Amino acid sequence: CPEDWGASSRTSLCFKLYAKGKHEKKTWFESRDFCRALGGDLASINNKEEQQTIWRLITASGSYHKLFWLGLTYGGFTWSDGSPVSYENWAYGEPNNYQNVEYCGELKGDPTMSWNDINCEHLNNWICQIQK
Amino acid sequence: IPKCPEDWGASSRTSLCFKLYAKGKHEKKTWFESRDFCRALGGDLASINNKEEQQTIWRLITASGSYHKLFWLGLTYGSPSEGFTWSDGSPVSYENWAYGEPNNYQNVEYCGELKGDPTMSWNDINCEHLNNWICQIQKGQTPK
Ligand SMILES: [Ca+2]
Ligand SMILES: [Ca+2]
Ligand SMILES: [Ca+2]
Structure with a gap:
């Protein structure tokens, strides 16, 4: 694994925590771009191993209790009667409300390592x- | 397939991408600061390893009307350890430098700059x- 990056055990994944300060916290979208501009992406957690790895990273750094953006993201219309949407007559720019807010998953940096959207x-x- | 970032002059047949930094006279830098600037971005001071790469840079100069300006290049004089000779110029065969010697010669003093005109000539x-x-x-x- 690269320049000081948590080395997984059974996955080719390397994790690195970015919590340099409050004033430098980013949004999920900025965080993803940031990681992607590094030839990577926001961390995905697919097993307990990867989890302990991140936790060790949190311990070694002493980032206890801070929240972190993980690559978790959420994301059309259907008829109630089951019929298929074979026809649409939305007004200009519609539908659009179902996109005013988006939800992402953050990791709670303590022993539970729990996620919240x-x-x-x-x-x-x-x-x-x-x-x- | 590797490509160049947020519009950085791309060298068609090579892997290098170039970008001019001439924010004006009061934003100029030293070679080292420049080198630190470039590396910070994830890049480095520009090297010109062939005519095609030179031309890429020249086109960047023309697109920004940055004519007659001088730019820092990655050109730097490294002081080869074989550079010592005797008074008459003869090469040094036998050697008996103290521990860690010679070492004062390694000081980095000279660097190369690009003259942004049609010649694209270099000067140390x-x-x-x-x-x-x-x-x-x-x-x-x-x-x-
Ligand atoms: Ca809750
Ligand atoms: Ca929630
Ligand atoms: Ca000179």
């Missing part, structure tokens, strides 16, 4: 992942 | 001088 525009620390 | 000058500069980045990479 919140507005993707909130300011958070984040965790990147980049292939070995 | 003191690295401490303030100039505009040019960075390069590997295709497939992204500024930071």
Whole structure:
């Protein structure tokens, strides 16, 4: 794994925590771009191993209790009677409300390492992942 | 397939991408500061390894009307350890330097600059001088 990046055990994933300070917390979208501009992406957690890895990273750094953006994101219309949407007559720019808010998953940096979904525009620390 | 970032002059047949930095006279830098600037982005001071790469830079100069300006290039004099000779110029065969010697010769003093005119000619000058500069980045990479 790259320049000081949490080395997974059974996955080619390397994780790195980014929590340099409050004033430098980014949104989920900024966080994703940031990680992508590094040849990676926001961290995905697919097993307990990857989780302990991030937790060790949190311990070694002493980032206890801080929240982090993980690559978790959520994301058309249907007829109630089951019929298929074979026809549409939406007004200009419609539908659009179902996109005024988006939700993303953040990691709670304590022993539970639990996830919570919140507005993707909130300011958070984040965790990147980049292939070995 | 590797490509160049947010509009950085791309060298068609090579892997280098170039970008001019001439924010004006009061924003100029020294070779080292320039080198630190470029590396920070994830790139480096520009190297010109062939005519095609030179032409890429020249086109960048023309697109920004940056005519007659001087830019820092990655050109730097490294002081080869084989550079010592005797008074008459004869090469040094036998050697008996103290532990860690010689070492004062390694001081980095001279760097190269690009004259942004049609000639695209280079000149070595003191690295401490303030100039505009040019960075390069590997295709497939992204500024930071
Ligand atoms: Ca809750
Ligand atoms: Ca929630
Ligand atoms: Ca000279």
